[PDB]
From Swiss-Prot:
<dbReference type="Pfam" id="PF00258">
    <property type="entry name" value="Flavodoxin_1"/>
</dbReference>
<dbReference type="GO" id="GO:0009055">
    <property type="term" value="F:electron transfer activity"/>
</dbReference>
<dbReference type="InterPro" id="IPR001226">
    <property type="entry name" value="Flavodoxin_CS"/>
</dbReference>
<dbReference type="InterPro" id="IPR050619">
    <property type="entry name" value="Flavodoxin"/>
</dbReference>
<comment type="similarity">
    <text>Belongs to the flavodoxin family.</text>
</comment>
<keyword id="KW-0288">FMN</keyword>
<keyword id="KW-0249">Electron transport</keyword>
<dbReference type="InterPro" id="IPR008254">
    <property type="entry name" value="Flavodoxin/NO_synth"/>
</dbReference>
<feature type="domain" description="Flavodoxin-like">
    <location>
        <begin position="3"/>
        <end position="165"/>
    </location>
</feature>
<comment type="function">
    <text>Low-potential electron donor to a number of redox enzymes.</text>
</comment>
<keyword id="KW-0813">Transport</keyword>
<dbReference type="InterPro" id="IPR010086">
    <property type="entry name" value="Flavodoxin_lc"/>
</dbReference>
<keyword id="KW-0285">Flavoprotein</keyword>
<protein>
    <recommendedName>
        <fullName>Flavodoxin 2</fullName>
    </recommendedName>
</protein>
<dbReference type="InterPro" id="IPR029039">
    <property type="entry name" value="Flavoprotein-like_sf"/>
</dbReference>
<dbReference type="GO" id="GO:0010181">
    <property type="term" value="F:FMN binding"/>
</dbReference>
C-alpha cells in the first residue's frame, strides 16, 4: 500500500522527523505532505497515514496544523490506519508535552480510524493525562523532543517506524 506522511512545522523539527519516517519505512510507498502548503484532502486517497503534530504555546497545536484541523472533520478517513507522532519538551513543560498529540488522537478517533505506533510511557517524563491510553502506561503515538532528547530522537523514530510498518501491514494481511 502507498502511505501518506503528513506534518506541519514552524521551524524544521516535524519536517526532519517526516523525512526520517518515510525514509526508514520506505520512500517507495511513503510520501511526504507538508500541510503548511499541501491540502489534507489527498489524505483521503492513501490507504494508511502517519500524522505528526508539534505542541506549541502551552498545549496549542502548530499554527499550520490549526489551518487544516477544520478540514480533517470533513475528510474521509473512516477505516484508515493512522500512526500519530508528536513533538514537545519534558524539561520546560511535561504538563503540555505531546498535548497536541492527545488532541489529534481524540480528533481522529471520531473519524473511525485504527491506530498504530503506541509506546510504553516507562523511561520517559511527562505526567500529562492527554497523550496516553490504557491506564496511562502507553502513549497515543511516537513522542519526541528536540530541546534535550535531540541526541536520541533519531533512534526513537526508526524504532517506531520498525513497529508501525508491521502494525499496518499485518492489519492489511
Ligand atoms: C514558544 C514555544 C512554546 C512551546 N510550547 C510547548 C508545549 O506546550 N509543550 C511542549 O511539550 N513543548 C513546547 N514547545 C517545544 C516545541 O513543541 C518543540 O520544539 C517542537 O519540536 C516544535 O516543532 P516545530 O517547530 O517543527 O513546529 C514550545 C516551544 C516554543 C519555542
Amino acid at each position: 500500500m502507498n502511505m501518506g506522511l503528513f506534518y506541519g512545522s514552524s521551524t524544521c523539527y516535524t519536517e526532519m522527523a517526516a523525512e526520517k519516517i518515510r525514509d526508514i519505512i520506505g520512500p517507495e510507498l511513503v510520501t511526504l505532505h507538508n500541510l503548511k502548503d499541501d491540502s489534507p484532502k489527498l489524505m483521503e486517497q492513501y490507504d494508511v497515514l502517519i500524522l505528526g503534530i508539534p505542541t506549541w504555546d502551552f498545549g496549542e497545536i502548530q499554527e499550520d496544523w490549526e489551518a487544516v484541523w477544520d478540514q480533517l472533520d470533513d475528510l474521509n478517513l473512516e477505516g484508515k490506519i493512522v500512526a500519530l507522532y508528536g513533538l514537545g519538551d519534558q524539561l520546560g513543560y511535561g504538563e503540555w508535552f505531546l498535548d497536541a498529540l492527545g488532541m489529534l488522537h481524540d480528533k481522529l478517533s471520531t473519524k473511525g480510524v485504527k491506530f498504530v505506533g503506541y509506546w510504553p510511557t516507562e523511561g520517559y517524563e511527562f505526567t500529562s493525562p492527554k497523550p496516553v491510553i490504557a491506564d496511562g502506561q502507553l502513549f497515543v503515538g511516537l513522542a519526541l523532543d528536540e530541546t534535550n532528547q535531540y541526541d536520541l530522537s533519531d533512534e526513537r523514530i526508526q524504532s517506531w517506524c520498525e513497529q508501525i510498518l508491521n502494525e499496518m501491514a499485518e492489519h492489511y494481511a
